Short mmCIF file of N, CA and C in Angstrom, two decimals:
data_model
loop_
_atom_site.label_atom_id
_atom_site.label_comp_id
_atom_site.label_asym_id
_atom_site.label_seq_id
_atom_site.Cartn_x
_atom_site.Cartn_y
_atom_site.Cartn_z
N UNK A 1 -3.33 20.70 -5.18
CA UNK A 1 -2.24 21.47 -4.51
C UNK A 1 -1.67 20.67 -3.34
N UNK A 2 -0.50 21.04 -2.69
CA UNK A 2 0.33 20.64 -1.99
C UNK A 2 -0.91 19.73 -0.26
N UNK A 3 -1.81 20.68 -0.14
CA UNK A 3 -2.62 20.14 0.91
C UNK A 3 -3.17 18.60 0.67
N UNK A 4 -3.54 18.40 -0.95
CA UNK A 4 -3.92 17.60 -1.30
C UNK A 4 -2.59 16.25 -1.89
N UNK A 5 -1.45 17.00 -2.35
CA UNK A 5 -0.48 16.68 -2.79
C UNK A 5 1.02 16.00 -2.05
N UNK A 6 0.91 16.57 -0.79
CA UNK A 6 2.34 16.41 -0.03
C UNK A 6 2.06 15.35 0.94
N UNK A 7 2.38 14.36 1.29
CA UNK A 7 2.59 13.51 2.04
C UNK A 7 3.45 13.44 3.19
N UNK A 8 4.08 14.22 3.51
CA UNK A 8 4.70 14.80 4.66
C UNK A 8 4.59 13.41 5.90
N UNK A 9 2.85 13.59 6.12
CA UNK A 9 1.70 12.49 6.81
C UNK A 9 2.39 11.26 7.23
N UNK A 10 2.83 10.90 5.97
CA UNK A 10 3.41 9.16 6.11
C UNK A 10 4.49 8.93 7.60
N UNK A 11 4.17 7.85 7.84
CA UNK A 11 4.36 7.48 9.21
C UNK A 11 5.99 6.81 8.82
N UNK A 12 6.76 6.94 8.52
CA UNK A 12 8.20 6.56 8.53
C UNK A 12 8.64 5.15 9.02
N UNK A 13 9.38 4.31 8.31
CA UNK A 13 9.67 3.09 9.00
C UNK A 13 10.36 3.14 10.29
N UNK A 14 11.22 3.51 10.57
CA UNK A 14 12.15 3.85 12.22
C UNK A 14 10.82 4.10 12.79
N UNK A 15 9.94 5.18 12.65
CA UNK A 15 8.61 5.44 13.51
C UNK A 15 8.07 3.57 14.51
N UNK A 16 8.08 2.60 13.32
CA UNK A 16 7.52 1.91 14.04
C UNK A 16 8.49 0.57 14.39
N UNK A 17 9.50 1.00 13.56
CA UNK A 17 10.17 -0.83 13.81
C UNK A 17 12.06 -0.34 13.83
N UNK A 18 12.63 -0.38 14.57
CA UNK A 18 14.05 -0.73 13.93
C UNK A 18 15.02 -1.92 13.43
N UNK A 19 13.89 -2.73 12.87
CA UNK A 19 14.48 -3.64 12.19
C UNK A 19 14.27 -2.89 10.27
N UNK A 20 15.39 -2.91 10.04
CA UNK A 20 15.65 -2.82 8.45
C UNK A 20 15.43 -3.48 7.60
N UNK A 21 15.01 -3.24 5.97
CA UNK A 21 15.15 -4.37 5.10
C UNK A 21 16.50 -5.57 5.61
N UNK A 22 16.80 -6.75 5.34
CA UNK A 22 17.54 -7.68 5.19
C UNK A 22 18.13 -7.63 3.66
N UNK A 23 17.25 -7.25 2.67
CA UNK A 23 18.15 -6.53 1.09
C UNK A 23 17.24 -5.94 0.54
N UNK A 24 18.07 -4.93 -0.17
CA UNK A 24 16.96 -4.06 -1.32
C UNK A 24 17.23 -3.77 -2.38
N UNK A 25 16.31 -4.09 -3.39
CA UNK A 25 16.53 -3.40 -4.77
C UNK A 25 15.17 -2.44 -4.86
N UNK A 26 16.17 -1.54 -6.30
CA UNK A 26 15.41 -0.17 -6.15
C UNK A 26 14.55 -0.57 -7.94
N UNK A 27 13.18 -0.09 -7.64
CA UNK A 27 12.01 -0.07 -8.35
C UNK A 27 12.76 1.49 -9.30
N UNK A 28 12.41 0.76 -10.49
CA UNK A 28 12.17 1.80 -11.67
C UNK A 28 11.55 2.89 -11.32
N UNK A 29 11.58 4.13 -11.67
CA UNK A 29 11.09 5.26 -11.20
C UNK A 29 11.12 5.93 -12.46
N UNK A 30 9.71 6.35 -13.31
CA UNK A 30 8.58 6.28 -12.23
C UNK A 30 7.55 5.23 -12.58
N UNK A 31 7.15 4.93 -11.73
CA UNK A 31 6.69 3.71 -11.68
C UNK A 31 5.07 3.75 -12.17
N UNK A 32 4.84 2.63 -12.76
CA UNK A 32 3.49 2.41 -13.75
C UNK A 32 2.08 1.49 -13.02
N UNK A 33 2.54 1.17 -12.30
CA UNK A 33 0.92 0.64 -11.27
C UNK A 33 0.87 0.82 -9.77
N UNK A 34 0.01 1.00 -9.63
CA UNK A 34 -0.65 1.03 -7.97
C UNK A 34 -1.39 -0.14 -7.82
N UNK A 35 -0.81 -0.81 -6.67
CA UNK A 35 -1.71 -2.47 -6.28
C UNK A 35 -2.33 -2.28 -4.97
N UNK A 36 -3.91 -2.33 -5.34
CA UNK A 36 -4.03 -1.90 -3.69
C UNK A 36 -4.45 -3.74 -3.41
N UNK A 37 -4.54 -3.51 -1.83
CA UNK A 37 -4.38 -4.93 -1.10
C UNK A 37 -5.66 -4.42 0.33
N UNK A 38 -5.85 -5.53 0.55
CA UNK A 38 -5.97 -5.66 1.50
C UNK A 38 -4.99 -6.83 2.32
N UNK A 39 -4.74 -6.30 4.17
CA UNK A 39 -3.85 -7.32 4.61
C UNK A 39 -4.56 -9.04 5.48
N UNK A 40 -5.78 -8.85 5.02
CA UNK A 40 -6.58 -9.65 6.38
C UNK A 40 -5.93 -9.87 7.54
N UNK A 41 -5.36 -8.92 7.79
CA UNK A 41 -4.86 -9.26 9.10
C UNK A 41 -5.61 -7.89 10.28
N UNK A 42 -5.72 -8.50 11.44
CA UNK A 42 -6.30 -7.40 12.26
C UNK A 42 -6.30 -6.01 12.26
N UNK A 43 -7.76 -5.44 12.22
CA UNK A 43 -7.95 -3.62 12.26
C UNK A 43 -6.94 -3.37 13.29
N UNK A 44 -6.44 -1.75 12.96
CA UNK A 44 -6.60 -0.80 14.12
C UNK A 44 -7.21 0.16 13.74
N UNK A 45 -7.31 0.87 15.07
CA UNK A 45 -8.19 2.24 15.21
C UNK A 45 -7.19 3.39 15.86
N UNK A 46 -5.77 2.87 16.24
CA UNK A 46 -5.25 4.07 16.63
C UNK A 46 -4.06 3.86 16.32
N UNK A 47 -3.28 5.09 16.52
CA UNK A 47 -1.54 5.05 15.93
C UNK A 47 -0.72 4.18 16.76
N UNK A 48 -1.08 3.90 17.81
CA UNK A 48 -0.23 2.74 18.40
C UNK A 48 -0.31 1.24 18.39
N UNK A 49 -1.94 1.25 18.16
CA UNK A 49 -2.14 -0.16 17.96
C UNK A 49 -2.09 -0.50 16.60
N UNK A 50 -2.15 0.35 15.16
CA UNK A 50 -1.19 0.55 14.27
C UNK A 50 -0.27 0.24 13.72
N UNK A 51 0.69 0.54 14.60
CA UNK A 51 2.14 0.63 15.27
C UNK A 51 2.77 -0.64 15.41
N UNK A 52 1.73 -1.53 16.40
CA UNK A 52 1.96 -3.09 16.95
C UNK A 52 1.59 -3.87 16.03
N UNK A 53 0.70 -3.54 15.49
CA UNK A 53 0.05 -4.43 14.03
C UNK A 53 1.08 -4.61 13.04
N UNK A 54 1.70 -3.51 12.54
CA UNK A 54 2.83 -3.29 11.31
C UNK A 54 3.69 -4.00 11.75
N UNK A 55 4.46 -3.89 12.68
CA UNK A 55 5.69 -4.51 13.61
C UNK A 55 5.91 -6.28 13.06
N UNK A 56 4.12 -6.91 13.16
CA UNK A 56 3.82 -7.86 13.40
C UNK A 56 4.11 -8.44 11.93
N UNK A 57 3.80 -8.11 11.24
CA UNK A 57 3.16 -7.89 9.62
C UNK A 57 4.72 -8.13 9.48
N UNK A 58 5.48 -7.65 9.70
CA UNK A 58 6.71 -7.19 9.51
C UNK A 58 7.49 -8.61 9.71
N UNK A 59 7.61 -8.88 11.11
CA UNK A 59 8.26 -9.62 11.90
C UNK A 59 7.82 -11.00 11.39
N UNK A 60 6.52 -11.28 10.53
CA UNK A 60 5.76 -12.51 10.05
C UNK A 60 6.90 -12.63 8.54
N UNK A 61 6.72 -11.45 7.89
CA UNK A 61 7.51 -11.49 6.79
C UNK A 61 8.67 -12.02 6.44
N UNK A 62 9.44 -10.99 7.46
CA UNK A 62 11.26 -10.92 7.56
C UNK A 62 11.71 -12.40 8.16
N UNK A 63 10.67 -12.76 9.18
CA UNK A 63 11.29 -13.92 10.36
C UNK A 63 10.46 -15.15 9.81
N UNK A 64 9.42 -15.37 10.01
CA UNK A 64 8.52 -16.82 9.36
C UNK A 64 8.65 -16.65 8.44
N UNK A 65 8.59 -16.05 7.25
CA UNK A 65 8.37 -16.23 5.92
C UNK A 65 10.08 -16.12 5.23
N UNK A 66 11.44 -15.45 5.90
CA UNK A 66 12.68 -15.19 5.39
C UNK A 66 12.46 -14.62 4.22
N UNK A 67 10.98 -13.48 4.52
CA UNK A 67 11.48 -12.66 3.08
C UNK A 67 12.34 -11.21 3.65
N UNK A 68 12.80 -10.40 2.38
CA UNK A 68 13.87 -9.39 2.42
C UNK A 68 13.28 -8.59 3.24
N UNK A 69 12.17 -8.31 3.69
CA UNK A 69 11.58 -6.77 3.39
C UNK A 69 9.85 -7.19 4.23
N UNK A 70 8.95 -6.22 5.00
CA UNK A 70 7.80 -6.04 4.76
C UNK A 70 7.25 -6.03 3.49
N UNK A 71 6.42 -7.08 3.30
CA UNK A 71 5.98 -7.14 1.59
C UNK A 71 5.32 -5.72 1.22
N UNK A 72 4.59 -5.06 1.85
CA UNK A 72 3.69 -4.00 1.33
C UNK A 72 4.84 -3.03 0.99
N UNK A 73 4.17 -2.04 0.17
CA UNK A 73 5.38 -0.53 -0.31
C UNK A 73 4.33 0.45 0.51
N UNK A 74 3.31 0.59 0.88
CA UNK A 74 2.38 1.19 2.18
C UNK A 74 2.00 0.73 2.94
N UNK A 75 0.78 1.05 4.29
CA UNK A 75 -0.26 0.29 4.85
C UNK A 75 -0.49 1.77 5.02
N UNK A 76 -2.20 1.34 4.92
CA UNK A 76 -3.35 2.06 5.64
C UNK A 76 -4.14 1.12 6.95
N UNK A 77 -3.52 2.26 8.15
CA UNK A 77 -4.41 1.89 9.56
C UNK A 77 -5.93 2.53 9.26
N UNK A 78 -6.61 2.14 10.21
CA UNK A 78 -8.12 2.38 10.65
C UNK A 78 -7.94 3.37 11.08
N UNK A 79 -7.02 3.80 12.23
CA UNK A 79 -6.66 5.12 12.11
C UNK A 79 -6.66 6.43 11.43
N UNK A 80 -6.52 6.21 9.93
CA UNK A 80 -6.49 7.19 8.57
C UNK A 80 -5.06 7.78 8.36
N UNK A 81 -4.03 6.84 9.23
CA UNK A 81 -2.44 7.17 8.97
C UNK A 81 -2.07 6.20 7.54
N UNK A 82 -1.17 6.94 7.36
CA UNK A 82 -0.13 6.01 6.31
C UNK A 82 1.05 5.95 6.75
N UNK A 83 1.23 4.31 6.55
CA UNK A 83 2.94 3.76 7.10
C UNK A 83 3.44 3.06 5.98
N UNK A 84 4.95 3.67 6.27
CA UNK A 84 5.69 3.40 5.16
C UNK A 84 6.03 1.87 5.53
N UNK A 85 5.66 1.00 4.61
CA UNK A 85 6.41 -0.25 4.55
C UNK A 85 8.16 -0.24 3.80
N UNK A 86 8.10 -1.00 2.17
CA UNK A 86 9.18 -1.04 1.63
C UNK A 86 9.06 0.21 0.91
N UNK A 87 8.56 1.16 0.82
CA UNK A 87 8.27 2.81 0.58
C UNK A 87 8.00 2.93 -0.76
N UNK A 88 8.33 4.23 -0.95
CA UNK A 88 8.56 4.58 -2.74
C UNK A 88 9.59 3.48 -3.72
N UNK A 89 10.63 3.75 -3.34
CA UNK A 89 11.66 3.05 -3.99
C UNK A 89 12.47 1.97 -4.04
N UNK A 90 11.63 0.72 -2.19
CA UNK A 90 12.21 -0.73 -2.85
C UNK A 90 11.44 -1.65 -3.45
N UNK A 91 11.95 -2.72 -4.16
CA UNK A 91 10.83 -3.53 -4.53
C UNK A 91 10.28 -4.42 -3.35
N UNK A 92 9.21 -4.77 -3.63
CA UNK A 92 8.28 -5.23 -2.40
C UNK A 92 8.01 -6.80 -2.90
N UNK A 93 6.73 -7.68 -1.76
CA UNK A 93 6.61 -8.79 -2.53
C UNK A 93 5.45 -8.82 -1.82
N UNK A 94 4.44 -8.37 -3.08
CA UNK A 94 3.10 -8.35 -2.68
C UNK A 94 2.03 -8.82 -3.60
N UNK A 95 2.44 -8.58 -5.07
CA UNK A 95 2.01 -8.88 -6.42
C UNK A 95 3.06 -10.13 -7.48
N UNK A 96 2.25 -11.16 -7.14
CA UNK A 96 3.45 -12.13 -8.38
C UNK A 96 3.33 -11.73 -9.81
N UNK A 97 4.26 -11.38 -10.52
CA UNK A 97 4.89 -11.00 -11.42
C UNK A 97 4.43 -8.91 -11.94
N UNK A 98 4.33 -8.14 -10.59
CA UNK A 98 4.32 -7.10 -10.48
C UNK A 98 4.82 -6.16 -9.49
N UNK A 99 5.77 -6.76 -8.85
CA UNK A 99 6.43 -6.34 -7.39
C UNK A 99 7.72 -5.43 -8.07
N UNK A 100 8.04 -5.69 -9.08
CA UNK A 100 9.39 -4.85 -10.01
C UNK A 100 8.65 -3.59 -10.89
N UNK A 101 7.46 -3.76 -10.99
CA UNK A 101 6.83 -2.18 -11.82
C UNK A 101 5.47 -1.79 -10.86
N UNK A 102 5.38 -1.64 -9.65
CA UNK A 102 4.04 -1.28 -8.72
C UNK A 102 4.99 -0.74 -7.31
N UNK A 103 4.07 -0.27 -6.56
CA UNK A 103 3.82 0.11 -5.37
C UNK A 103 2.55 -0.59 -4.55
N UNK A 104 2.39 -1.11 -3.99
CA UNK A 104 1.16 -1.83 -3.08
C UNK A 104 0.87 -0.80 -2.12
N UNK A 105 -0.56 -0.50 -2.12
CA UNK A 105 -0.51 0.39 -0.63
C UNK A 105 -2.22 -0.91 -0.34
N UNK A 106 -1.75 -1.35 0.85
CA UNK A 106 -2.99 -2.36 1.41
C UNK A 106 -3.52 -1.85 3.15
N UNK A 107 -4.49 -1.53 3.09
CA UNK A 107 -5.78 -1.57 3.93
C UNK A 107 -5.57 -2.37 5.27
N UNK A 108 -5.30 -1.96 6.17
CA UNK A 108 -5.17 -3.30 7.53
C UNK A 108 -6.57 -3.39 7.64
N UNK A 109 -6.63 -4.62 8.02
CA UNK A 109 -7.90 -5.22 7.79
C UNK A 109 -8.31 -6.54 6.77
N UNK A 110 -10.41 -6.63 7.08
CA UNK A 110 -10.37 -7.35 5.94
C UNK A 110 -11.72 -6.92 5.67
N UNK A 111 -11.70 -6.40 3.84
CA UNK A 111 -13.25 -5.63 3.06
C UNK A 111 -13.44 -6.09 2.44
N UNK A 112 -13.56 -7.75 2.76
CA UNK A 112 -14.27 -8.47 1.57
C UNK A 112 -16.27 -8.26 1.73
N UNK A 113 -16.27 -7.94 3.54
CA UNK A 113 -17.66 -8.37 3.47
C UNK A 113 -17.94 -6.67 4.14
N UNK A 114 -17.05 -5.60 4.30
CA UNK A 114 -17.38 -4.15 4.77
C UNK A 114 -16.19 -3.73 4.10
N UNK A 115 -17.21 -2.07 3.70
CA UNK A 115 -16.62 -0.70 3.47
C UNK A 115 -15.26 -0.43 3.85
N UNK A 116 -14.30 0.21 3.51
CA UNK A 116 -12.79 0.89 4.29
C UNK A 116 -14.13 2.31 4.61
N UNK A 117 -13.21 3.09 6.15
CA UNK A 117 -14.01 4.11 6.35
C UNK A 117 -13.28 5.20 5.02
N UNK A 118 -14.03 6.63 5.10
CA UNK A 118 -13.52 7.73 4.38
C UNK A 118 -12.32 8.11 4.91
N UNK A 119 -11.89 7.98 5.84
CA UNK A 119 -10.75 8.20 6.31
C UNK A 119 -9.74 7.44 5.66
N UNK A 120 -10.00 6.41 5.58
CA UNK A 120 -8.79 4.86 4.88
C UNK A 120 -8.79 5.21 3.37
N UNK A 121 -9.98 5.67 2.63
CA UNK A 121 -9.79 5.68 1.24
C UNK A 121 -9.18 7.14 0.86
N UNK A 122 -9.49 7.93 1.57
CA UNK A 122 -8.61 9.56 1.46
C UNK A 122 -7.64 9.51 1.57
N UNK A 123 -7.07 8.82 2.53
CA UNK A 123 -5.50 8.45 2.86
C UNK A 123 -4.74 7.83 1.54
N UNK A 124 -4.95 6.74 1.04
CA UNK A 124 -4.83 6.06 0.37
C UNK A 124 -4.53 6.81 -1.53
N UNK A 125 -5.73 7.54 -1.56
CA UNK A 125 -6.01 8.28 -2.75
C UNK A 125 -5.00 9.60 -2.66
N UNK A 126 -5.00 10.19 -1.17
CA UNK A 126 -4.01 11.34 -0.95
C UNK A 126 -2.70 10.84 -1.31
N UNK A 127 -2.39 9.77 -0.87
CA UNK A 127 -1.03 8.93 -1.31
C UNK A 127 -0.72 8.73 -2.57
N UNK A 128 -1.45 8.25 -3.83
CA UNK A 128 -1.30 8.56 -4.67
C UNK A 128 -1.48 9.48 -5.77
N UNK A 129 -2.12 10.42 -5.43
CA UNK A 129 -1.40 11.99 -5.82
C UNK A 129 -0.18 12.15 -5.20
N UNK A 130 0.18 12.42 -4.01
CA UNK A 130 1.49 12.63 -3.96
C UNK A 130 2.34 11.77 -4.50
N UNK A 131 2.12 10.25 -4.94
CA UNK A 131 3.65 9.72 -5.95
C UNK A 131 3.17 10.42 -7.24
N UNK A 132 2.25 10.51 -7.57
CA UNK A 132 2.29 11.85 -9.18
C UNK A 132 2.67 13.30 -8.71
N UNK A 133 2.83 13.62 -7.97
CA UNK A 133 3.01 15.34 -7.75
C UNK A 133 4.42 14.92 -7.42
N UNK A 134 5.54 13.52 -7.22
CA UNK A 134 6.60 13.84 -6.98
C UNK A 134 7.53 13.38 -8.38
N UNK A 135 6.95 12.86 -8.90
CA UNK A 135 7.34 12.05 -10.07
C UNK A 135 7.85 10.63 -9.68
N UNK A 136 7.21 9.90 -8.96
CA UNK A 136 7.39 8.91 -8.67
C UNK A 136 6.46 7.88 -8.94
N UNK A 137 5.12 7.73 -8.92
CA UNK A 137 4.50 7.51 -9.91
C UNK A 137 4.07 8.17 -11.43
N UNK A 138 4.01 7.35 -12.52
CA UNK A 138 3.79 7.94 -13.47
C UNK A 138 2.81 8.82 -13.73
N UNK A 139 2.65 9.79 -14.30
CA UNK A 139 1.62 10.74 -14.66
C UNK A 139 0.31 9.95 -15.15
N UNK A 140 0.76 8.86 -16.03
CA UNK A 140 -0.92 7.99 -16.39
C UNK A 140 -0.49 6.92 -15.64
N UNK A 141 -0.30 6.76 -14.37
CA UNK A 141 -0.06 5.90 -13.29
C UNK A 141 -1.57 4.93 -13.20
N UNK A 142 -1.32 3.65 -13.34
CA UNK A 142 -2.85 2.77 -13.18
C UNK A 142 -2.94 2.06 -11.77
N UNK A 143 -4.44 2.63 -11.75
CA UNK A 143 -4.32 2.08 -10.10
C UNK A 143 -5.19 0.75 -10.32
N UNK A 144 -5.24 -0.54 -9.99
CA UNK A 144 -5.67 -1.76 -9.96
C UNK A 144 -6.02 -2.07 -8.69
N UNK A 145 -6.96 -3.38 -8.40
CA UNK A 145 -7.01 -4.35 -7.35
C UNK A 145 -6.27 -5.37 -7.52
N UNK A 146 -5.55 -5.76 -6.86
CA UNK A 146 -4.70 -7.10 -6.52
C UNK A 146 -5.79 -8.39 -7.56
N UNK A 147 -6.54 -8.24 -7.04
CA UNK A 147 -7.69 -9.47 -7.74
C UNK A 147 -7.82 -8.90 -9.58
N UNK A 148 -7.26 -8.04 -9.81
CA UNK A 148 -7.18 -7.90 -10.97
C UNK A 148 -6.01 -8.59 -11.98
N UNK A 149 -5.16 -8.85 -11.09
CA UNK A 149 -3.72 -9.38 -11.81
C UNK A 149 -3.31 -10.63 -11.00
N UNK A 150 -4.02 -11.13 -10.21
CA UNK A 150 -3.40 -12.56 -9.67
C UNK A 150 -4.62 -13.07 -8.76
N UNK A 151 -4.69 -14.17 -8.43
CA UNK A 151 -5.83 -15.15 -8.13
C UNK A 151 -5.63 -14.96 -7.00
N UNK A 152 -6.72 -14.14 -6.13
CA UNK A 152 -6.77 -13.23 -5.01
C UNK A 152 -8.10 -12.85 -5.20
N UNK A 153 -8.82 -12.54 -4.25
CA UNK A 153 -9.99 -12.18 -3.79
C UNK A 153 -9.73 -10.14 -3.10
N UNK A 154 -8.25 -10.01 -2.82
CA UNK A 154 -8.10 -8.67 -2.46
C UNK A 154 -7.78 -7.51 -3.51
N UNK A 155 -8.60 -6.70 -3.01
CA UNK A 155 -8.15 -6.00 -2.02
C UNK A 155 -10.23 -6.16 -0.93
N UNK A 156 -10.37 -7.27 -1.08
CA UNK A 156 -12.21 -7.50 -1.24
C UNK A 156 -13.02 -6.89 -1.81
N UNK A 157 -13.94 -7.03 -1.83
CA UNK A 157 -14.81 -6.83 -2.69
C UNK A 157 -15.63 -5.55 -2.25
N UNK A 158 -15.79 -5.36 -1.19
CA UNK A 158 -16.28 -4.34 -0.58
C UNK A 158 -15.48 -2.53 -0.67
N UNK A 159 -13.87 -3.20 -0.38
CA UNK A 159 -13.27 -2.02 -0.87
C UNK A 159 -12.58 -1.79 -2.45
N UNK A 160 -12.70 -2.89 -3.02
CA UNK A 160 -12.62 -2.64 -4.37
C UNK A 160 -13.99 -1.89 -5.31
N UNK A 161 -15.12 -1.94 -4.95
CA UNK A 161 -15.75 -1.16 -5.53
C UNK A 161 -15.70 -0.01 -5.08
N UNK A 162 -15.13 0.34 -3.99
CA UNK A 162 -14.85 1.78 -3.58
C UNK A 162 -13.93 2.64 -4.24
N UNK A 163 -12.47 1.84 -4.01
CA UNK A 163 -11.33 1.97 -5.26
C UNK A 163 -12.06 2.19 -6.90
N UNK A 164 -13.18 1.71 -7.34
CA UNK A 164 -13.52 1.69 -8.61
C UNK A 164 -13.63 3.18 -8.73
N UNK A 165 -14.48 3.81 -7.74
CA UNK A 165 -14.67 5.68 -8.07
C UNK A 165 -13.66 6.37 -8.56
N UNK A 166 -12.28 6.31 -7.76
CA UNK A 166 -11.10 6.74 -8.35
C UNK A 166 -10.96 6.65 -9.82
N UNK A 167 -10.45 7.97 -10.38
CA UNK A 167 -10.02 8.54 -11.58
C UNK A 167 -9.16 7.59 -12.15
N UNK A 168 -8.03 7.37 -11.03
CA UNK A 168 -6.79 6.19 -11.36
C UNK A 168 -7.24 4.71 -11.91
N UNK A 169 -8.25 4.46 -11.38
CA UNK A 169 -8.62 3.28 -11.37
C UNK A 169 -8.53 2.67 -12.77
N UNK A 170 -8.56 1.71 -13.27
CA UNK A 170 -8.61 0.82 -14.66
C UNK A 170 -8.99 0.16 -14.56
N UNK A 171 -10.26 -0.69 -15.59
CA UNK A 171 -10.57 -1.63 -15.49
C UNK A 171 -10.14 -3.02 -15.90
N UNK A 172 -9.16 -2.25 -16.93
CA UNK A 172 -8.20 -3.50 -17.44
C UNK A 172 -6.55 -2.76 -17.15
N UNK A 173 -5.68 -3.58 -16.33
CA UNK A 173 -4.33 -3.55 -16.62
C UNK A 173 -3.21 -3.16 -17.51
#
């Protein structure tokens, strides 16, 4: 149900940055994989430091790297918030040759060698029920690890066997 279902939660891009995509194209809807990630880039533990982290993530992307967009289509803080990166509906660049049929939602942090708390994986899992309760992910929507479809070690190893419990989960692509 909707408690479990509505995402309301998600932390909005204006929330943390007013810098905009630079261009966007719009992802097929509804969309057929979930890529989770991890970002190795520094924890937070609260909505502001969060906040400064994403910004960063952001500003690395758009400005050092001259890509379009924050690569992620989520982030999960330590916090147990969800922030909208390139969201539901742009394409992102997080997965090589899966950024046009996925959504990425990645973990700040790094779980190659520790757990995400219950807070980070509820978030995460709450998130995708709500793209199935909106029709935005597909109804047999597959949820993967990044290390499942490209030569990557993420979303680590620590939170990929966590991700394995999930219903969504697949073991093959």
């Amino acid at each position: 149900m909707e408690f479990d279902e509505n995402c309301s939660e998600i932390i909005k891009r204006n929330e943390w940055t007013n810098v905009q995509a630079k261009n966007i194209n719009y992802l097929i809807i509804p969309i057929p994989y979930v890529i989770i990630h991890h970002t190795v880039s520094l924890e937070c533990n609260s909505k502001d430091t969060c906040i400064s982290n994403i910004e960063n993530i952001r500003s690395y992307h758009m400005d050092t790297l001259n890509w379009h967009d924050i690569g992620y289509s989520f982030l999960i803080g330590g916090d147990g918030n969800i922030y909208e990166g390139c969201g539901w509906n742009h394409e992102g660049a997080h997965t090589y040759g899966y950024n046009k049929k996925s959504i990425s939602i990645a973990f700040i942090g790094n779980f190659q060698n520790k757990s995400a708390s219950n807070k980070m994986l509820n978030a995460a899992h709450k998130l995708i029920l709500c793209g199935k309760s909106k029709g935005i992910l597909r109804e047999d929507v597959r949820v993967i690890g990044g290390k499942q479809v490209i030569a990557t070690l993420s979303p680590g190893f620590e939170l990929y066997k966590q991700i394995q419990n999930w219903p969504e989960w697949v073991s093959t692509p």
